[PDB]
Symmetry: D2
Subunit: 268 residues, 4 copies
């Protein structure tokens, strides 16, 4: 008996086999969940990647900046899962910030249009997905988004940290709306994970100083974490998302669960 | 397949059929856990109460202010579960504050000896149980304690709120030690639950004004909670404790999980 | 000897005699500060309003969404205060959210373009003013912005609360940059103040339910505040801003000071 | 015109010329305050030390664990300042934890009697001083205590961190009582200061590993602080205490002001 047996769950945010969402989707399928996937722009690529998941799942296009995609999404999901069925879960694993808003590009030099695009994709879209999908969610359902703890400023992450602060605030409002449907809304604040993009950044893609700073941050994270932190292993994060999708945290909403090795609880 | 199948878990804090720990123990057994119980002082009473749990579990005496009890505890547990077996989980569901430290007795009028007894039982003892039991815990294990959010001052709870603030700090240090064993340490911050003691307090046992204030607090809690809060139902709390005892929050330690309906995330 | 004697301070955000910034400016002048004022759009109106301040102060136009205004601002300030002089202080008292983002208009129904405009004005602009002005600030200087505590969701404030969460994050990054100049950056989180706009909202301008909710929030604030809260009196807020502008909080930066009667420290 | 002209202020916690309280007292006198001092045990020593303050101030004995001292304190203060006069300010700069509760002595090995003594002196006593002194405080008055940010666990500080967590909670309750008198209660959370005791600890007095860890913590603090941190300079801390004693933070109570260089706002 899987943790998520018979649950119907939408998972956004797969782009590579290193996406946190890929691991969320693998774990959820291992636990009995029936999935619908959403992808942005490179659908042929995403399908090829998702062919490696343990079970079949339909893939729907979703650009969160596209109002038409959002307006049609619930109907497209219902067609995929069948009329008369609703979702039990939704995973938001979507984030973006233009290069001007991250790395060695100075914090003050990021144009607002770039920051605004990043906030749109990384924070506002959590509300936009909830608006689209709550009408097709069952009572007892769960919406989960991916977060990085923004309560203190960090090198390099710059405006992405600001976007996460906005996301945390959005989640608290989404919980008010979601509760009317009997649905929970929460974020998982993960420690650093070496996705393709993060590996590129560590390698200097957004400047050497920024890569060096991120490498220092990752090392400090494992050091501070009482149980350690493995940046090469997304499974503990995926498991935590599944815990929130399950029936086992039924009184938690508007909240943040930290899948970070405990690092945020320790100064040094 | 239960959430906790094959896990060996110690549960402290049962005194009545309304104890949060009673519900923790029922749920954990429903999920396949094999339990050892600890009780304070009234062992015949506790045995009679625990006869109503769905499965048998040995009951061991533990007064957390008694150093001899603590020194012998791991040996007594090992005898109960069998040599060569260790615990996978520990639940601390223990709290006390003398009457002078709660209710209408003025905050300033509580003698230190009373406050100190309350802190001993309610906060220090989380460290004392961990010291006793970590040497008989398996890697991957989990220690969970019960908390009430003390980040803002409240009427009536007075020095018990101070004790919880101390407990939260103790948990963060216990996580450092526990991590050396591969063990997690976390608290569950519950909303208000109408245990026998709380019902007595609402009824005026610690003064009418204090009862009135607590009644107001409970009503506000349900109002603020986006998914509501039922003070007569401990099951959602028990489920959350079981989530932390399980393998599904493997990267969370030194932390607090709020089983409170989301109330702490909303101002009004 | 005034608290701010000989300090040169820029104050943004005056639009009426009820603006928090008007009071900040009056108090700072009472304490010896020499001011430069900035205003948005209705300059003749603002001049007429500012004629009531106890001392003369030049008024410069600043629309924070106008890159040309921002690019020219330091030069315009220097002309006002004289070549070879720099500022010791900067006050950001600027906020806006379109009606779709506040009140009874549903949270989900706010278009991104509206939210983005609000975030631009209310959060990003704190970075944009700092970028413009740090090059003309003295060591030991202070940048202060106005904040409302967004750590928990509230009725009616909706996307403005999200904007404040973003502002708090921006302040922490601005402090990193400002520190290179020997300059502090902090926010003052005020309790509710009955400005003209807030009075209109309480009166129903953004819907009756929203007005009712805000009225309830204000009453709860005075109740929770251990020293009370007078929503008709901005002076305690203005004084707190002046404290941060002064030499008396020299080791505080990236931070938030709560001028709220202590309400955020109390649950009830 | 000094910041504190004509204010009558009690300052506890002087033991050496490196005590944070010595600097608080020097700065307050420089700003016009008339002081009463309290000292523990070594009164001849304290008098000799306080002879170096810029102005005369009476010294009263106060052991905060001595109920008789506390019961007589207001009468002794009134005799010192004259009948019909009251205090405007109170500074609590008192802390202690036995060696078993700090350094390399393992966290689990601290006996409760030692922890309890530390909590008594370091946390409960903030309530005990307020109880004693509020009846002789003027409206508009201010009580300030010294704090170190305990929200995350640290090496070496061990049970002292737990005591600070308790102190923060006590302050929030003291603010409720103090508000009835028109009096504010707040803490100043300082960065690390090289007092004699701290220098001894860095030098290995509580074990080499603990000294090494504290040295690492101090270095990280200056690094994280956007405006830097000088552990050899208590003046910025003293100034912040004086800001809270003044009339310039009139709407802040139950709160914590961080005089730490901004370090707590930055991850790295
Ligand atoms: N290190 C990490 O990899 C990391 C990642 N996350 C979050 O996890 C989520 C998933 O990102 P990932 O798995 O890291 O990486 P990713 O690059 O695999 O996935 C990002 C996804 O966003 C999608 N996306 C972008 N623009 C759009 C759009 N217009 N419409 C729809 N989708 C779009 C894109 O297609 C892709 O699938 C994001 O919310 C991240 O912020 C959270 C925490 C950590 C983190 O960044 C961090 C930082 C600081 N301290 C600790 C941790
Ligand atoms: N309302 C509640 O019932 C409530 C209870 N808790 C915690 O849950 C835990 C269990 O208490 P309960 O189930 O409420 O009540 P309870 O009275 O059933 O159990 C308390 C237990 O402590 C035991 N105990 C006392 N002294 C000793 C000792 N010397 N040695 C060993 N054991 C001892 C006692 O035998 C009993 O089993 C405690 O940590 C509580 O603080 C947490 C949160 C809420 C809460 O108080 C609250 C307050 C404010 N906002 C929200 C929630
Ligand atoms: N209640 C309040 O009045 C209140 C106000 N503040 C902040 O105080 C600051 C000043 O606003 P106020 O004094 O309330 O009101 P206001 O309407 O007098 O001033 C707002 C100013 O923004 C200016 N502005 C708008 N758009 C632009 C632009 N394009 N370029 C430049 N300037 C522009 C405008 O000209 C005006 O001067 C803002 O940051 C508010 O968010 C902070 C806290 C409280 C608050 O909203 C609150 C909410 C919840 N809990 C507690 C408190
Ligand atoms: N580093 C520091 O020196 C430091 C000190 N403080 C606080 O500042 C306050 C003053 O201590 P200090 O100036 O450091 O040192 P201190 O040793 O000069 O003074 C401590 C005082 O306590 C007095 N005391 C002890 N027992 C009693 C008693 N029975 N009755 C009455 N008085 C008694 C004693 O006489 C002495 O005057 C305490 O509350 C400290 O916790 C706050 C923050 C920092 C800090 O410890 C820290 C830790 C971690 N991150 C950052 C900062
Ligand atoms: Na570690
Ligand atoms: Na469910
Ligand atoms: Na509710
Ligand atoms: Na496990
Ligand atoms: Na009040
Ligand atoms: Na200065
Ligand atoms: Na620094
Ligand atoms: Na005053």
């Amino acid at each position: 008996t899987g943790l998520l047996d018979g649950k119907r769950i939408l998972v956004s945010g797969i782009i590579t086999d290193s996406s946190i969402a890929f691991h969320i989707a693998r774990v959820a399928q291992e636990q009995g969940a029936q999935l619908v996937l959403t992808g942005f722009d490179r659908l042929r690529l995403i399908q090829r990647i998702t062919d490696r998941l343990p079970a079949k799942a339909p893939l729907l296009e979703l650009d969160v900046q596209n109002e038409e995609h959002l307006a049609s999404l619930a109907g497209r999901v219902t067609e995929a899962i069948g009329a008369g069925n609703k979702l039990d879960g939704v995973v938001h694993s979507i984030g973006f910030m233009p290069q001007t808003g991250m790395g060695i590009n100075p914090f003050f030099d990021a144009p607002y249009a770039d920051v605004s695009k990043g906030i749109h994709i990384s924070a506002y879209s959590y509300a936009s997905m909830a608006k689209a999908l709550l009408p097709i969610m069952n009572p007892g359902g769960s919406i989960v988004g991916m977060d990085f703890d923004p309560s203190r400023a960090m090198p390099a992450y710059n405006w992405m940290t600001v976007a996460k602060s906005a996301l945390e605030s959005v989640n608290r409002f989404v919980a008010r709306e979601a509760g009317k449907y009997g649905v929970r809304s929460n974020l998982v604040a993960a420690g650093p994970i070496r996705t393709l993009a993060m590996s590129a950044i560590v390698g200097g893609a957004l400047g050497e100083e920024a890569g060096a700073q991120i490498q220092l941050l990752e090392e400090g994270w494992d050091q501070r974490a009482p149980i350690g932190w493995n940046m090469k292993d997304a499974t503990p994060v995926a498991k935590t998302v599944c815990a929130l999708l399950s029936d086992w945290l039924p009184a938690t909403t508007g909240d943040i669960i930290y899948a970070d090795g405990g690092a945020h609880t320790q100064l040094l």
